[PDB]
Amino acid sequence: SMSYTWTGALITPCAAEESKLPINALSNSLLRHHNMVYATTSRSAGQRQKKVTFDRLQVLDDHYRDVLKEMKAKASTVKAKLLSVEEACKLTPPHSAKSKYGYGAKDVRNLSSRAVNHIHSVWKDLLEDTVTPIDTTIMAKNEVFCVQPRKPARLIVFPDLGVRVCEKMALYDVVSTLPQVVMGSSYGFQYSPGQRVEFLVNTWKSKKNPMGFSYDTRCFDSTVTENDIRVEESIYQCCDLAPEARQAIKSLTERLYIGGPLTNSKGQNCGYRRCRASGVLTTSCGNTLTCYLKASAACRAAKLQDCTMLVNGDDLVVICESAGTQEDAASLRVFTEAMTRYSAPPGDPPQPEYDLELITSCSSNVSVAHDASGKRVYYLTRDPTTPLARAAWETARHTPVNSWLGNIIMYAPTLWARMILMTHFFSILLAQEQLEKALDCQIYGACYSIEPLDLPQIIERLHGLSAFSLHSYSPGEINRVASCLRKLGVPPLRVWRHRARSVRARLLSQGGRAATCGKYLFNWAVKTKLKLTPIPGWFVAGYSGGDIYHSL
Numbered sequence: 001s002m003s004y005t006w007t008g009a010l011i012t013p014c015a016a017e018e019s020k021l022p023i024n025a026l027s028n029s030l031l032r033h034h035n036m037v038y039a040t041t042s043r044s045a046g047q048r049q050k051k052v053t054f055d056r057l058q059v060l061d062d063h064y065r066d067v068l069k070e071m072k073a074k075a076s077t078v079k080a081k082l083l084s085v086e087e088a089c090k091l092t093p094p095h096s097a098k099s100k101y102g103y104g105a106k107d108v109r110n111l112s113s114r115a116v117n118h119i120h121s122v123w124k125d126l127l128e129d130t131v132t133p134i135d136t137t138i139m140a141k142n143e144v145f146c147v148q149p150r151k152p153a154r155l156i157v158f159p160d161l162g163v164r165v166c167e168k169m170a171l172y173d174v175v176s177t178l179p180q181v182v183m184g185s186s187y188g189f190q191y192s193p194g195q196r197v198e199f200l201v202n203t204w205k206s207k208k209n210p211m212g213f214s215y216d217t218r219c220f221d222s223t224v225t226e227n228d229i230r231v232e233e234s235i236y237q238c239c240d241l242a243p244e245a246r247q248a249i250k251s252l253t254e255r256l257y258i259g260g261p262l263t264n265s266k267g268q269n270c271g272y273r274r275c276r277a278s279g280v281l282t283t284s285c286g287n288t289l290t291c292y293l294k295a296s297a298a299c300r301a302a303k304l305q306d307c308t309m310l311v312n313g314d315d316l317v318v319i320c321e322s323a324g325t326q327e328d329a330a331s332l333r334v335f336t337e338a339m340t341r342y343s344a345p346p347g348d349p350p351q352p353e354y355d356l357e358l359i360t361s362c363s364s365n366v367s368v369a370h371d372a373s374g375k376r377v378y379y380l381t382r383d384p385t386t387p388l389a390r391a392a393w394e395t396a397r398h399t400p401v402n403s404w405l406g407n408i409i410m411y412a413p414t415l416w417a418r419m420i421l422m423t424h425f426f427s428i429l430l431a432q433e434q435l436e437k438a439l440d441c442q443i444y445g446a447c448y449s450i451e452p453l454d455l456p457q458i459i460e461r462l463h464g465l466s467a468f469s470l471h472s473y474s475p476g477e478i479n480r481v482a483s484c485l486r487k488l489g490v491p492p493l494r495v496w497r498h499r500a501r502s503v504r505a506r507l508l509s510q511g512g513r514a515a516t517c518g519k520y521l522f523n524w525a526v527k528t529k530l531k532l533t534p535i536p537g538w539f540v541a542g543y544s545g546g547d548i549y550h551s552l
């Protein structure tokens, strides 16, 4: 079965699209090599269509069915509630795509009768009809990258706002609670970055002769079959559910999750989907379960010993007991063959690693630094090229999501986040007096409204107090950052050190929460260090593409 079928009608844009990096008076202070940065547009949608369109064969063995049965047994202990309309409405983002039926995200959040009324009728229709395919819009994503020796736009597929609210009613409690019960410590989204590092390190140490590898499936969403989506439904149905919820889950599976027609922004028919939709509520939970099922079964087929898996979305790492270097390489070949039989072939073949730091997953690697006491601290980092490119875009253009803010929160302990992102944007915020203004950002796919002044308390909680005192970074980490700065024409770290002194002094001058930001975020910038004492529902699950929002 083909992941997609196309009519030939184009994937059209809704708003205007810029590909060229916008420039303002602040741009050159961050990034000089402007022509290296670009945003994807619908012009490249054709190229992406060819990538994501292929046939899927699936061969399912006993290992696969043995793991599914075990997953079902754990799912049978889960009790999930139906959300009310009001509750589901409050989870809708303010800038979520408006309905085609005359109401938008702000109407939903307000509980206006027109919105609430349409929602009730969509809900009723789901309960009464379990066969009619539900429409979806297909759009090209506008995302910023650095050129590499251009990527075509990614595609988002999502149903109408009324349906998305009904998904929350039926499934929000399920996708929030089920994954951790079924997958235990292997469900990646339960961890803060700090807890994640601690788990990777403790897992690595729990093995006598440790071996680990990342496994990255080629275009995962397209690899997901009707079988996979039905199996996924059968897991949800093991839950203790309200009758309306059972019916609505079955209905959404048959009518939406399994597949359906694709309509462009101008209302024309683009084709038909028979794989995972990227923009529905179950996208993250479905992918994680499916990746866990296939991967756990693959481990057994390859006879890997004492496996510990870590899964979030389509991203996967396994840490296990080495059988010897030659025997490990053979077992990974078998692992890959099984995953391929299950329809999930790798992009690049997996490689066994015998140091935790040589494993790359979710674009991130573990690295080492030292705190104020001098004790080694592990933390997660990545190549700063994409975050910096996006920082440059957001310096000249206000965007829906503030990637700079997300990156500061998620990568707060890193050299590049602390010296560059924190310095640059706090300076921008000071000049406009916008320190107390709440900003939208994405954490694990979910949208959060956060005031910049709350970063110290947020950072402390996700990474620990050590994130404000790390020094003596690895030579490899330093060189990767410096190299990236030269590549993009970003000023070197010594210049940022100078700018940070100014930003800190300005923050302190204002007192209050601002002074707190100056004290904790920029303590790395001065010789006479101030002694850092403590300062007086964020990680349940992942919701990528799931239209989820939280405030405070």
Ligand SMILES: CNC(=O)c1c(-c2ccc(F)cc2)oc2cc(N(Cc3ccc(B(O)O)c(F)c3)S(C)(=O)=O)c(C3CC3)cc12
Pocket: 188, 189, 192, 193, 196, 200, 212, 310, 311, 312, 315, 316, 317, 356, 359, 360, 361, 362, 364, 365, 366, 380, 410, 411, 442, 443, 444, 445, 544
């Ligand atoms: C199975 N892979 C892992 O679980 C992770 C490893 C890993 C690396 C090496 C190794 F050997 C083992 C594991 O690193 C990670 C770093 C992140 N982060 C970055 C980040 C990546 C993507 C998004 B996105 O799509 O929403 C995001 F929001 C933040 S973060 C905030 O720092 O924790 C994550 C987050 C949950 C998605 C996972 C892993």
Ligand SMILES: CNC(=O)c1c(-c2ccc(F)cc2)oc2cc(N(Cc3ccc(B(O)O)c(F)c3)S(C)(=O)=O)c(C3CC3)cc12
Pocket: 415, 470, 471, 472, 473, 474, 478, 492, 493, 494, 495, 497, 524, 525, 526, 527
């Ligand atoms: C200690 N207080 C300081 O202000 C620091 C001085 C310094 C030294 C002498 C002097 F006269 C003035 C300042 O150098 C530092 C180096 C770092 N690192 C990062 C880093 C910063 C800049 C460059 B640069 O472009 O050469 C670099 F190569 C690496 S590191 C080796 O990993 O710990 C840090 C990290 C943030 C805590 C602090 C300082």
